Amino acid sequence: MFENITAAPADPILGLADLFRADERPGKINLGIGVYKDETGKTPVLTSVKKAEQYLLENETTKNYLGIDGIPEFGRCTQELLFGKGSALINDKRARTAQTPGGTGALRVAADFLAKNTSVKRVWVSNPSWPNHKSVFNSAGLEVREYAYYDAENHTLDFDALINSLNEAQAGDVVLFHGCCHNPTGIDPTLEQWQTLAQLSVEKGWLPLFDFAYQGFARGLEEDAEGLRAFAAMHKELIVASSYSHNFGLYNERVGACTLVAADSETVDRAFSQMKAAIRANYSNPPAHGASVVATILSNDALRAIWEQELTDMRQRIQRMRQLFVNTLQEKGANRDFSFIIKQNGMFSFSGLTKEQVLRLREEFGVYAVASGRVNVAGMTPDNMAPLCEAIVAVL
Amino acid sequence: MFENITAAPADPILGLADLFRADERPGKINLGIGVYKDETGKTPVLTSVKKAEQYLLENETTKNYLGIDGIPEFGRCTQELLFGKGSALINDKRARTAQTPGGTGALRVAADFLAKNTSVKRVWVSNPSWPNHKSVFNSAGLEVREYAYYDAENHTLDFDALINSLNEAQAGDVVLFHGCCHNPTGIDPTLEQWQTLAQLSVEKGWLPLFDFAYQGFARGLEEDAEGLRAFAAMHKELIVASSYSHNFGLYNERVGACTLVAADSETVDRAFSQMKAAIRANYSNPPAHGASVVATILSNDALRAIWEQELTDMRQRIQRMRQLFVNTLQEKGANRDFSFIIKQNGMFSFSGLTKEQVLRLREEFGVYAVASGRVNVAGMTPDNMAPLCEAIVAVL
Numbered sequence: 130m131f132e133n134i135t136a137a138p139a140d141p142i143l144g145l146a147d148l149f150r151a152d153e154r155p156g157k158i159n160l161g162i163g164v165y166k167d168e169t170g171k172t173p174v175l176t177s178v179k180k181a182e183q184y185l186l187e188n189e190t191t192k193n194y195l196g197i198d199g200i201p202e203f204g205r206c207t208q209e210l211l212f213g214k215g216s217a218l219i220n221d222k223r224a225r226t227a228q229t230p231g232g233t234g235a236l237r238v239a240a241d242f243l244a245k246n247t248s249v250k251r252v253w254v255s256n257p258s259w260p261n262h263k264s265v266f267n268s269a270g271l272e273v274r275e276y277a278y279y280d281a282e283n284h285t286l287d288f289d290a291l292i293n294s295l296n297e298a299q300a301g302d303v304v305l306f307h308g309c310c311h312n313p314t315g316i317d318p319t320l321e322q323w324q325t326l327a328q329l330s331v332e333k334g335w336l337p338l339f340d341f342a343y344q345g346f347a348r349g350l351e352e353d354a355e356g357l358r359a360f361a362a363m364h365k366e367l368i369v370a371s372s373y374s375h376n377f378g379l380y381n382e383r384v385g386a387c388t389l390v391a392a393d394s395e396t397v398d399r400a401f402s403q404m405k406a407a408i409r410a411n412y413s414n415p416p417a418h419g420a421s422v423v424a425t426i427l428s429n430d431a432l433r434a435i436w437e438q439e440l441t442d443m444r445q446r447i448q449r450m451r452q453l454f455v456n457t458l459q460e461k462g463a464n465r466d467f468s469f470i471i472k473q474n475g476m477f478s479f480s481g482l483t484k485e486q487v488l489r490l491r492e493e494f495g496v497y498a499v500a501s502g503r504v505n506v507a508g509m510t511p512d513n514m515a516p517l518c519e520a521i522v523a524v525l
Numbered sequence: 526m527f528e529n530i531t532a533a534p535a536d537p538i539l540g541l542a543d544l545f546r547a548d549e550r551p552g553k554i555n556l557g558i559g560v561y562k563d564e565t566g567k568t569p570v571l572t573s574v575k576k577a578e579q580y581l582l583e584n585e586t587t588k589n590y591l592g593i594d595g596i597p598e599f600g601r602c603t604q605e606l607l608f609g610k611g612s613a614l615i616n617d618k619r620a621r622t623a624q625t626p627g628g629t630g631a632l633r634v635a636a637d638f639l640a641k642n643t644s645v646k647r648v649w650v651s652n653p654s655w656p657n658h659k660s661v662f663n664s665a666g667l668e669v670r671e672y673a674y675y676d677a678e679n680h681t682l683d684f685d686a687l688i689n690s691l692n693e694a695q696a697g698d699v700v701l702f703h704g705c706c707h708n709p710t711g712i713d714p715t716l717e718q719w720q721t722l723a724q725l726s727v728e729k730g731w732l733p734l735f736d737f738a739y740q741g742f743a744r745g746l747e748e749d750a751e752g753l754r755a756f757a758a759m760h761k762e763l764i765v766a767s768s769y770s771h772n773f774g775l776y777n778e779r780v781g782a783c784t785l786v787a788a789d790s791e792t793v794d795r796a797f798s799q800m801k802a803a804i805r806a807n808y809s810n811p812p813a814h815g816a817s818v819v820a821t822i823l824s825n826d827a828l829r830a831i832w833e834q835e836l837t838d839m840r841q842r843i844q845r846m847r848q849l850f851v852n853t854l855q856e857k858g859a860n861r862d863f864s865f866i867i868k869q870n871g872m873f874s875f876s877g878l879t880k881e882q883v884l885r886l887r888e889e890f891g892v893y894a895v896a897s898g899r900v901n902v903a904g905m906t907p908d909n910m911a912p913l914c915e916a917i918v919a920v921l
């Protein structure tokens with residue numbers, strides 16, 4: 130049966146890792162990683178996470194199954210984190226959260242729910258987006274279309290081409306919005322633009338799906354949800370899929386959630402049971418550890434405190450490196466204005482380099498970036514900053 | 526879009542739980558659970574698990590992502606656990622394991638890989654079987670067909686009708702075999718019968734898919750795999766989906782594996798990359814905690830030692846209760862021979878009770894069973910043994 134199964138293409142993001150590890154050159158740099166990396170070059174376990182993991186070690190009495198929607202205050206706490214604490218959505222009981230294996234697992238869970246319980250046939254995702262988006266939606270048997278977004282010339286969001294491609298895009302189509310720290314461009318709508326997209330979204334009849342994977346990495350935990358919150362103000366129905374893998378350093382524990390808001394209570398409950406049904410045939414019920422650690426930190430004011438500073442330090446380290454990258458570049462001879470690097474959010478940026486410049490940097494130097502020119506600013510440390518910039522300058 | 530979404534039916538297994546919790550009667554009993562329960566009535570955390578969870582608390586330096594296939598020695602260790610240590614399958618490098626979110630996550634992962642990379646259109650499952658089987662295969666777009674298995678008259682495996690229904694069942698159809706502790710009947714093929722099914726399996730051209738959820742709960746960790754191992758002797762290709770949820774008491778950490786054995790190395794590698802691709806669009810990579818605990822136990826001869834005794838105790842507790850349930854029944858005045866309860870394995874048995882006897886038990890008494898008459902023997906304690914049997918005897 131398996132005789133004539135063909136190989137499957139290497140993942141754009143994942144496969145570069147092997148190439149790196151395995152190239153075993155000297156002062157080599159990996160900017161193709163999708164993970165935060167501190168000044169030393171490692172991805173530690175947040176102190177507050179470690180603290181919550183001792184608390185659970187001492188206090189857990191059973192490892193019995195969670196419900197299909199997981200841990201209730203994990204639920205609550207992400208609802209308030211997304212929609213703010215006094216949200217009508219929460220008071221009116223219009224949203225329901227299911228604990229999922231990561232943000233990817235929430236995307237997929239949203240995908241089978243829509244694919245089997247609704248008339249959606251198509252999901253619009255930006256050009257560019259995170260590659261694994263086309264795949265979770267195609268594996269559910271949904272057509273993924275692309276709207277415009279980024280300007281390769283001006284290094285920006287060109288809103289005009291974005292809104293124009295989102296014309297027609299028929300009523301009852303799913304439009305996917307990255308809520309902040311757009312992977313890969315790091316370019317995000319302004320609060321005027323989000324408001325426009327919200328207004329246009331109810332006029333046109335689209336179903337928005339926020340992919341929220343980096344809350345807290347742009348300008349702060351509440352400011353990063355203004356977007357989601359402008360849309361939630363004007364819609365009846367909405368779907369949010371978030372991941373605690375970046376802001377909690379909880380990557381391999383698979384933590385995320387798929388929130389459903391519906392027009393009213395009765396409906397979010399009718400619709401969430403069919404969401405439960407999808408989970409029940411996908412992985413049955415969610416992994417407890419990481420979401421226990423996430424709910425213990427967010428509910429204890431001391432641990433939440435520490436965590437917020439840990440998030441804050443991660444956010445400012447990345448802001449430090451965006452600044453120092455355009456400066457160290459300007460200094461070493463950079464031929465081009467790279468100041469757009471500072472306008473952008475979260476960990477990633479399109480450096481504005483050619484597929485052939487990117488291979489120049491891998492083959493001749495140690496610099497490893499994704500062939501799209503995406504560089505992860507988290508991998509730059511004040512230590513590798515000068516060699517790296519010298520390599521980028523040598524290929525410009 | 527969600528306005529006119531319909532309710533989704535209550536799960537056969539899960540929905541009874543609520544009915545119980547919420548009935549708030551006195552000395553009520555719940556045998557409709559699907560989790561082990563010790564003498565006191567609770568589902569503890571195995572000591573060896575807890576020991577391994579401290580070890581990781583101290584030693585984990587990062588929570589960075591796992592590969593898509595998860596932890597290598599988690600992989601290796603389940604390969605030797607399934608196929609024994611000197612297996613040719615292992616030595617020839619014909620098997621590949623991917624760490625999944627539970628046994629259900631391995632079933633579903635098998636289902637999408639087969640559905641999208643193969644010619645399978647159909648998976649044969651026993652009558653009866655675990656209800657969530659029809660659904661993980663149906664959610665991947667596969668036809669599930671049922672073969673015969675159990676004799677309601679004689680409380681056994683009638684092999685003749687099982688083999689006759691598995692006739693025709695076209696070449697390249699997937700057949701699902703429960704490796705031991707057949708849920709719900711507890712009836713399992715003898716090693717002469719497994720050898721028959723193995724022989725007939727290569728004559729006919731079926732693709733066997735073993736669901737292995739309870740290894741070690743029948744007669745012992747290797748004896749429970751002779752079956753799988755007789756089929757693995759004679760096949761080129763085979764798929765095993767196993768779960769560490771019952772034998773490690775690691776239910777809510779989602780621990781399980783999807784092993785793929787192909788005719789040779791190169792094909793298991795070609796095929797496994799498409800299995801990796803299946804995962805990569807489902808939940809992206811697996812939850813580290815529970816399978817770190819299972820790799821650390823199984824690799825440390827001291828902790829593995831303790832763990833094996835803990836499994837042995839759970840096994841003998843269940844064997845104790847099967848004996849004492851038919852005894853206490855004979856003594857309390859049981860009108861019927863229930864000796865067959867002792868022939869069966871692992872936590873479940875069909876008590877041989879009517880839907881209307883099972884509702885007498887719930888409505889009148891505190892006894893809660895699944896409407897199929899499935900009772901979970903782990904839910905019986907020497908303490909509730911007499912009131913329970915008194916109720917069963919009252920409805921006989």
Ligand SMILES: Cc1ncc(COP(=O)(O)O)c(CN)c1O
Pocket residue numbers: 163230231232233234259307312340341342372373374375384385808809
């Ligand atoms: C835009 C986007 N959406 C979802 C995810 C998934 O997150 P997770 O690893 O938590 O599944 C990522 C992470 N890579 C992402 O970048």
Ligand SMILES: Cc1ncc(COP(=O)(O)O)c(CN)c1O
Pocket residue numbers: 412413559626627628629630655703708736737738768769770780781
């Ligand atoms: C036959 C069978 N297969 C799979 C499973 C599921 O295992 P898990 O809970 O690890 O998904 C069970 C028990 N739930 C089962 O009885």
Ligand SMILES: O=C(O)CCC(=O)C(=O)O
Pocket residue numbers: 142143162163164259312590809810
């Ligand atoms: O490594 C992973 O599993 C996903 C990370 C990623 O694709 C990214 O952040 O770009």
Ligand SMILES: O=C(O)CCC(=O)C(=O)O
Pocket residue numbers: 194413414538539558559655708
């Ligand atoms: O997967 C679960 O949560 C329950 C499994 C079960 O009820 C059973 O095996 O009978």
